[model samples]
Target chain A: MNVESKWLEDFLVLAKVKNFSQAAELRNVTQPAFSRRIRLLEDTVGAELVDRKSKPIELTPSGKLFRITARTLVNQIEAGISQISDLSQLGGNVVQVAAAHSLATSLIPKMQQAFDEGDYKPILSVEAIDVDEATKELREGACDILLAFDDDILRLPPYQSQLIAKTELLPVSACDEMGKPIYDFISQGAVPWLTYSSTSYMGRQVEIIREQVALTPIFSSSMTDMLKILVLNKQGIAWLPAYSIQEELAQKKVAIIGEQSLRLPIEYYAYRYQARLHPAGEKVWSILCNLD
Target chain B: MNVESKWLEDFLVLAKVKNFSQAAELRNVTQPAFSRRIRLLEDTVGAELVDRKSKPIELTPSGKLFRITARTLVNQIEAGISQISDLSQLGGNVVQVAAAHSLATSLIPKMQQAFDEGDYKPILSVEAIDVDEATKELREGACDILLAFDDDILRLPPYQSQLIAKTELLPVSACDEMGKPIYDFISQGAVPWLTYSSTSYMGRQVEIIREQVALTPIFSSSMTDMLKILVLNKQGIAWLPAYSIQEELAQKKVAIIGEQSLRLPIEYYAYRYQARLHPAGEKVWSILCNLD
Candidate 1:
């Protein structure tokens, strides 16, 4: 009732060259098999496409019209096959990496530098994405590496993880013109706090200190960088990673406001699918695993 | 030697339940097959991931560590398989169409209307892309249908096409305050010509008329819509498709210039792959083929 794609391809070739034997040879099938396929195709369409009586086996008017349909179908099927094949074998010389916002800026540079110094230098393409998305990218094999804070999800099945570096979350605020803290945690009255969204990893970490400290939530965002910008504007105090604000701390643009006890310690982790990694990714992983 | 992903999945189940026979039952494999696969995995890693000496089969330290790797590899491989499998069976109730810029705006609405009125109503998502890219999308099965001009490429093997409608390219110019043509193609001094890029299908069509007309080129672009705007601004004369400037012509905003011989006739064609189409696509094709 239905013509197969192979038969359509055979018909296309037969229409082009107008010779059954030559088309069969081109299709890598026996002449008999090819002729039968064409006959089947004509049966499906309910119209004869080939004129067998012609010396060169000329196509009938219907066959000539059907040629366009046959060629389009065969080409489309081949294209779809090629596209899927390409998607399956996606990795190449470029090692794609997806990192969390904070670590992408702070830690990925170090990984890139390590790659450059090593003999097996791999071209690195990095995307700064949310932790959830980075983990998803790793699971989907969209990215060769994922850099994020150590989480229980990374320890779960389907993720191989390595501790890259350890850093502390420091409660800090913008400085006055004289380089003096504008906001202080020691104040009895609730201090204005620029906080992370409740669903974020950093937000959960800050919740521990929130129980002990009195603060008014001024702004909430999932992005640590957004909180940092609000902190720099002297609008409110925020808990930021020590590594993310190195320049601000060194330049005295912002000052730590809380006691050492308020600081939350966290570790940066590099994650990958546990299967066999691309050679370049393996080299990068080896370098990152030893970073700490 | 590379460890199989299947073996990794089996090992993960064994690590969790800590019972070979139970794990084998869970995996739907014979106890011998499951036990042998776990042994093969241990051999590949050069360390036993399972301690058979203990009841419930407790994992060794190495087994505990390899569990993370095994789970990650299996999940990632599964995710990749799912992603590819999903891509192959792309079409569903929605029939995606990629149409050339001009036809996308003018002809697609009529096709959409027909689909809306038909009993076999299918959701349509249309993208207005360049003719070449639209053809590529059709070939790749990214889109179910392609609407473009009648071209030699469309006549080639791999593209099944049907005539949708006929139109003509009319040289037109904007009108003055009195509704008189601001620019005339009959001018002996050579009127300013807003032309198409030489690489475009419309550009090639214009070339045939360019040899007969004496005009000084003012602006050139591949987009017919862009040239239409310039013509509306009374910038220069452009050979725009008749359908595209119906409103402008009716309102006397723009008037057709030159003789009837200067006008080039063209046809709009609907294209698709010749092989078996999706049920929704077949319905749409039948409707479009009968459109006239």
Candidate 2:
């Protein structure tokens, strides 16, 4: 039940190389010590993990099953250790922020600039994740702050959210060679539509529009940036966040289609736990809340 | 970067106990060796992980952050090791099946019974997961078999699927004291509805009905079984799989509501990787495909 983590690593290297001496060299251990450790691991688990009878040693059935588990164990430990070491390098004077993919490119830089003007500037560790994951990170204390679309879930107890900005989900398409909108909806024919997967927050919003429109879905993905790529390629039309398409819109690479009635107005909010926050996190939260 | 896993374990024990001597005893190591290992870990990461200056030691800010990573690392390793040990005890003659939450209760038992009748009976390792996760497990080779709804995602390359059964999603409500249906949609009034979350496959199917009906959503969750609990408590009406509600329907504890037009027909499929499958897995697939 209590197997040393190094034994797991030794087994993984052996599983890949299938040679005791080579595995030992790769693990930077003597062959005798490495073989003993592997044997000890087998005894600890009460099963034979490797077969020595084969020319090139093969894993027993149990060993094959344990291979996946051993790989998972080593990978998780290594990743966790590396991440902790990275955090230590920052001296821990950091505010971890989880932002939705759409806001990461837009609002995060603006907030970072505003934080620089303040006296109590904290190192901001930011990650762009899906709305659901960002919310979970905030609730679990994995991250100090969450920036995502405003939703009923964030308005509940144990969480405090403030409106940060407003934007629109605009229907847009790539411009043709004549600067004309390709795949326009003006003719009422079923146009190829690039859209969001149903599970995502933005996808659910687009579902409402789907009910009223005639569309032939060409591609669907959860990432807005991915849909933006398809739109730029003139593959089809997509409803994308206004903030994400600013450059393309300014350069006339893409054109907004449909009237104002087809647009979905959405708001972005900064969220944090209602309980005590770290000093650096508190500073970041206040700066984000005070921003215009 | 090359810290031993035991050092991570020692630090976690120290984090919880906040006493080096107690942690050393718990880890079954001498005090000097335990202390040395902890120091080595700190040196490897190039940061102090513990505040020894405090009367009852505390984790430094970096240590506090590293605590989460350490805990995750330890828990994952323990879980993986334990699972592998369990698999070994079964002699690795196990067919891992990941079933959708709805199918776990209804179809899995039937499959187990059928599997038992054959000579090549592999021990079943069953897990009830969401449809999305079940598909991913099948793709990643984490599970030998996947039992879930038929979707476009499954009917693609590198994967093979066979239709196993068909079922209907019925809108049902708890029977009142006199066996009258409660929250029935017989009238035009908006009745309280218990529904699936928008991300779930069932939720997307229900969306079509939602567009046609007028109901006030009282609760929404991804699990059909969770929604069933709400229906049994007379909290609200929900669309439940016919297979899942057979007992309740037969006993009149719950009654199907509305006209036949409200029903959503669905199919169940058995999915597996197209290439080489474990012998036991291939047998299970063949048996499932031949089922009436």
Candidate 3:
């Protein structure tokens, strides 16, 4: 169980891409050196991490566990380095705000205008990731602020927060031709229905319905924009942010679902604690609240 | 497959303790009421959840998955509630901090006290709990700032972070005796090794070493004062904060883990983000750095 450091690094690279030669190239080591390292790593961990005998390199159960542990260790080290900017602690006191793609595309633009600080950290350092990942980055101290549509922010482990805003999911449609009830025009078995990704809270809402109804279906696409276009092309019906397709819905192309019984109530909020919140943080929260 | 709303609440309770009877009490309902809910939930989901036959409830694979998902869902809902407090438009400025007992006990006192009133809200709140629970709470968004020992803070799925400060681990004993290095004293074994509860970071570090080296571990106390007496009574050697046990060590009653090699350097840091980082947060971080 005494693997050289080089062996572990090579194993990590190989794990990313099972191709030995490709992995070797990525690691910038000769194929023989890389192969030797793999063998060394397996010997040290007392397990065959990779299935060298197989065509496509695959991992044993131990490899999976090691991969997770090794990734965490590397990340832990990387995070430590991240705190030091060019190894300088007070180099730049930049206040950054990170959000999800949806939030980034909408609220972030508005946030820049809302703050009125032209010299602050340029809009966003890391654009927008998934909600879970974004909030997680916030918790780990990687990101400054979390601006997500879902209140999923509060439920974050061990974090403190306050309520900021709520929004009503307004139903939009061009005409009464499709009828006020969304289900009527939804065309259950004839055409496909598109909704949010299950990875998201709103998407999970769709999941509960799927589970309730018992459906195993395929999606034409996952992107909101793509779904909108597909709907316009008559590929399917989509459940999305009411405002996202406002123009199309206003034009009588897509019809609203459950105009009478369906209204998704959502909210946006700001969060931080004594450990990481700064002066600008309070100002933004206050400013966001004041806007109401 | 249809369960009453009451059952969802019951399921929520059962999940809290992972023990049916205890969770039942939390819901102010009888054990039978809670059991019925679990049965109904599993039936509705068309999957086996809890192994009711076990002495302490053990979740089936699907059940465990549901448990994690349920907890995450509940947390997200709570986070949402904080953001949508008005149940209408956005805005309610509140900052929450999550911390642990030891820091609240022997280490730093009020987290917000470190912040300046001019910049931070005097209304900030600090919740002191177990360090392990604090990180879990952060995942739930129960608090904003998560004040935790570096060791207790695991690299969660999507958290980002900053390293705030560092601390040293010192060994405490009734008499300096041989003044052996902390690691050997711990490994070659000490009689009746008094230790902090495995529930806290300090205690866990000792536990991890014992686990790694396969040493018989003992414990008489926690963040409080049990370990100090055990060492004083010649019960065994215990690891604790060096500065905290300075009196005992200076009096030749305890010893430092002389071999820095055996010692894992420990540090303390706070977890928060910009939007969530309130004025009080800034005050806390700033003061901790400037601490003499």
Candidate 4:
């Protein structure tokens, strides 16, 4: 989220012109300066933007994508300026990030600690809410960033225009009688189920139990703090965002049903509005990547 | 061409947020700050962007278009800063213009007059060229702006794009045979012919006759400025940009052909890079619109 580089709009006129000498004449500058501007563009992306050898020149795939990105950045820059100028501050250093309940209760804490005394100050906040709620914070600007994983983040919250930074996904689950909890849970006959609140992302996930077996088992709602009580009592099997039950797993309060299902690990990411870039954003992002 | 109003970009984001409270949070400020930003955007466009009363809120089409323009303006600001930092001031102001030979030549005198006494102190240098050349100038910044009623001005060149200030197109021709004598002569179905240089846009236009009627006409280059010479000598009928032939038309040195073929109209626009703007550049733009 904290990315620092010159912008894309700087290259539009020259890219369109495709000729340094000509562009130089229009800008009232030397040809070499314009060429340097183009080189700067390539440098920022860590890729050569144009095929210097092509007739009329052509952008590489990355270059083409960057071209559109540049145009958009230019537009946003204008938007940002207007937005910033009217503002009391040019930029906000603190970024509010929201995520699904699983990550909210589990991942955010561990992730938050890693950024001790860093450039980005993480105002650690969590809510084991559903995808819909997380998207709400993002859309409403309650959160400057949204971290979603497991389910399709894009499919979950609807958006007309989206700024997708990066994405990653990994899946893990408990074992079953067939040593395949995920498979049997969805394919084989009915089995005891752990139903978390439908209001949570896990609830949306656990609903598949009924769909796969075509039967509804007893369902329940509770927070991560209440997990030990529910699981120790063999209340029902629940899919959880790993971090939430980390302590329990370590204490033997929980165990993998099967080796393979236990190993099913899913991962996700952090995202934000391109318009807003906070100082702490980059620091948090870098540390998160290292967690892998 | 110079605009003093700023803050256009700020208005755009508020329009997107559609709520002062949410918009302020996006900027990491109080709501009042965001509202002030929207006001600045209005100053530039000389209009309000949103209707606060409506349930969902709405913007006039002009507001939306300006929102985009505001973005463009912000990019322009960035480019201007870069140019200033680089001190790129030697290439001279590039002006990309698209016009038929006649129009270009006809305007030369007036254009020369404007520059001679105009406020632009550095003296705007000229790039003597055509529509294709104008687009080329535009793409490369060969010129700060473009002018001409090439009719095809809006069609993006492989390199450059055109933006409108305000616009108009005018049709000019003599009464009736549709330059048939010229066409027949060029077709060499046994008549002599007079035509503009094929190197020029108007000359390239002759290819249309060949494709439609499947006739290849031998065309002798007829300079736009001296078309009256060819017409009087009965070399053949020749089409020209109206401005180029204005004097001749009034004097009846060349008769107006009202024929269908010669009745096509041409247009002109004042344009610049969508992503970059300068006081001088925009000033020229404003002048162009005043014509409307």
User: Which candidate's lDDT is highest?
Assistant: 2
- Which residue pairs clash within candidate 2? none
Reference contacts recovered by each candidate, as fractions? 0.00, 0.37, 0.00, 0.00
- Candidate 4, residue B271: Cα displacement in angstroms equals 14
Per-residue lDDT of B79-126 in model 2, one digit per residue for the tens? 656666655675434677788777767766666677654444666777
Q: What's the CA error at residue A195 for candidate 2, in Å?
A: 5.5
Clashes of 2: 0
Q: Candidate 4's residue-wise lDDT over A103-215, tens digit each?
A: 55555667766666633355444434455566655665555556666445543435322222232111223433343433233445554555557765445554544343433
Give me the runs in candidate 3 sitting further than 4 Å from their true place: A1-93, A117-123, A131-135, A151-158, A162-164, A168-191, A206-223, A250-254, A274-276, B1-292
Residue range A1-292, candidate 1, lDDT tens digits: 7779988988878778887778999999998888888889889999998899878788889988889888888888987675344223333544666666556556544554554434445545454444646677777776778777878998666788888877898999999999889999667698877666554677778878777788866444455665676688676799999988999999979999878889998887888884788777787778778877
Worst 10 residues of 2 chain A by lDDT: A112-121
Model 3 / residue A208 / CA error / Å = 7.1
| Every model's DockQ | 0.02, 0.20, 0.01, 0.02
The digit string of per-residue lDDT tens for model 4 on B222-253 reads 46655546555665556555555556556645
lDDT of 2 by residue, A185-276 (tens): 87768899998878677777777777677899879887888999989998999999998999899888999988887788888888887375
Q: What's the CA error at residue B71 for candidate 2, in Å?
A: 2.9
Candidate 4 chain B: 10-residue stretch with minimal lDDT = B164-173
lDDT of 3 by residue, A1-292 (tens): 4645566677788888899999999989898988887887888788888887887888899998998877777776665665443213121333445444344444443444564534332222222344445556776776665555556435464655555566544333233465343333344553344444344555544544443332222232224443454445453455566646666666666676544434566666655533545555555555545655
Per-residue accuracy of model 1 over B1-292 as CA lDDT, tens digit each:
8888888889888877889999999999999999998898899999977779989689999999988988888889977775443222222445666666567656544554455534445545454444435667677877778877887777567778889888889999899857888988665788867666544567667778777888865444455665676677666789999998998988989998779888988887888885788677788788778874
